[PDB]
């Protein structure tokens, strides 16, 4: 038993639910939250521009130490970072980015990260600005993750054509 709430069941461990991750985040403090990263841990705009902003910059700054350490992330890849004030961990996965050109074959690949933990609060990789389908986003995470995911879905439109749609 958890505590995340207001959940439609998809499958036997992926959940989903018409929510703001970051106010989830604050509320669950799960964890491990998931942000969707580029290689650069630029964390500018989409779900990765307000999950920063909810650290005041924080993991900003501990995004830059982490690059000039160790350099890019791949595409399909991740690291673990701090949660901050949102959740123990951040898993920080990068699905490709459609508007770059990026192959969205590496989207199972960016999923498969999900398995390395028990329980995760996530979004749809490769949705909103990185410009894939959310529906085919959906599909790959239940045909990939294997561990309990809730996804969470910031637009209402959006989240009923997934549920409606959803086989
Ligand atoms: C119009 C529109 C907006 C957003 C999306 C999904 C992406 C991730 O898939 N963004 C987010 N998902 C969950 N919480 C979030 N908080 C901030 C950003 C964000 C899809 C579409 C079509
Ligand atoms: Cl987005």
Sequence with gaps: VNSFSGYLKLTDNVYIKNADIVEEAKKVKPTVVVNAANVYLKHGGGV???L?????????????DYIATNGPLKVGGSCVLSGHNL???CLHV???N???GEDIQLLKSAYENFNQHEVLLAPLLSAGIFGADPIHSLRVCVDTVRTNV????FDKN???????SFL
């Design 52 to 64: 920063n902003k909810a650290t005041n910059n924080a993991m900003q700054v501990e995004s830059d």
């Design 87 to 89: 959740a123990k961990h």
């Design 94 to 96: 990068v699905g490709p």
């Design 48 to 50: 990765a521009g307000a």
């Design 150 to 153: 809730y996804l969470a879905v």
């Design 158 to 164: 959006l989240y009923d054509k997934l549920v409606s």
């Design 98 to 100: 459609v508007n770059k």
